């Protein structure tokens, strides 16, 4: 009865079902966990918000078209305005979190296409001016739940002030490496003939036990069309991709007044 | 007359032989973790218990 294709995930007051999964990935074979006393750093008693924040948040959906070049988000950035997770994040200097990432994309037995879904630690991307290096604004680096898109062209700006955004060039993974090698990162593929969802469980990954969430994204989430969407009755059709992410084993230190980042 | 001692850990023992007849010739003294900050931080005649009033 039980199947690699059928799964339920419950976190807090939220549940996901899928009937066309393809197993699930646990990044680097490690489930998330709380921070042990023998690896701890800040000494204040941490806040562990548990069910208030460790639950599925669904981002705004994006549309997959035959011409789409792909999508990216950063974490914890994409969830910074999500319910109590966002509040706990911004009221504290320090935070750590794992995640369950559930990417959703159904179609029909007559559609075709394949999405690579990658979780990338320290997903540093190229800037869009050749007058400077590492020249990206905080606002452009941290788009929140809307994330960003890849392009198949690189057109760096005439003036440095206009190029302070990522050059998200698809085939170089926005960072000067070949996209065909992205499979070294934890990943699944949503191949429409096979499955309609990808599930990745991510431990906290960093060179520190805990860090400043508002300064530093631990993971990138990349969705790249490896094989373009095609549908014979209408090649211009679009199908939604929906991203739903739950923080897990969240832990926060250094409580004070709320952080309100710059918006422009 | 070789002395085998623990190394300071890096990212486990080492050997020392003294070659000279004067101790002044020797390499650095071994790590001495001794301390007693209270001779400077609390040189008081009568014991002060933190949880108690300093003056009663």
């Amino acid at each position: 009865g039980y199947s690699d294709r059928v799964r339920q995930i419950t976190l807090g007051n939220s549940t996901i079902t899928t009937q066309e999964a393809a197993n699930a990935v646990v990044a680097y074979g490690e489930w998330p966990s709380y921070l042990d006393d023998k690896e701890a750093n800040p000494i204040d008693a941490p806040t562990e918000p548990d069910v208030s924040s460790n639950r599925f948040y669904t981002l705004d959906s994006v549309q997959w078209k035959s011409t789409s070049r792909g999508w990216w988000w950063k974490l914890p950035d994409a969830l910074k305005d999500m319910g109590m997770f966002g509040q706990n994040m911004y009221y504290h200097y320090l935070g750590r979190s794992g995640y369950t990432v559930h990417v959703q994309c159904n179609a029909s037995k007559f559609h075709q296409g394949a999405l690579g879904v990658f979780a990338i630690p320290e997903y540093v991307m190229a800037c869009n001016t050749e007058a400077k290096t590492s020249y990206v604004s905080y606002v452009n680096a941290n788009p929140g739940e809307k994330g960003g898109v890849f392009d198949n062209a690189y057109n760096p700006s005439a003036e440095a002030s206009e190029g302070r955004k990522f050059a998200a060039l698809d085939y170089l993974l926005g960072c000067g490496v070949l996209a065909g090698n992205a499979f070294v990162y934890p990943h699944q593929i949503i191949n429409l003939r096979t499955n309609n969802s990808a599930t990745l469980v991510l431990p906290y990954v960093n060179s520190l036990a805990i860090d400043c969430m508002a300064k530093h994204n631990n993971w990138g989430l990349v969705i790249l069309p490896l094989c373009k969407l095609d549908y014979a009755p209408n090649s211009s059709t679009e199908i939604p991709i929906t991203v739903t992410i739950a923080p897990m084993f969240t832990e926060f230190n250094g409580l004070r007044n709320i952080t309100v980042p710059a918006t422009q | 007359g070789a002395q085998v001692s623990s190394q300071k850990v890096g990212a486990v023992n080492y050997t020392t032989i003294n070659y000279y007849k004067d101790s002044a010739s020797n390499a650095a003294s071994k790590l001495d973790f001794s301390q007693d900050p209270s001779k400077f931080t609390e040189p008081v005649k009568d014991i002060m218990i933190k949880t108690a009033p300093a003056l009663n």
Binding site: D37, I43, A45 | F33, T41, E42, P43, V44, M48, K50, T51, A52, P53, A54, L55
Partner: peptide
């Protein structure tokens, strides 16, 4: 020998007042 570890502690409501002292003592 290491520098001091931090013990697990909660709060208090107590006549024990380690936050107060008198540095006139020379301590």
């Amino acid at each position: 020998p290491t520098a001091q570890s931090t013990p697990l502690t909660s709060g208090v409501n107590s006549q024990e007042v380690p936050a107060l002292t008198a540095v006139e003592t020379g301590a």
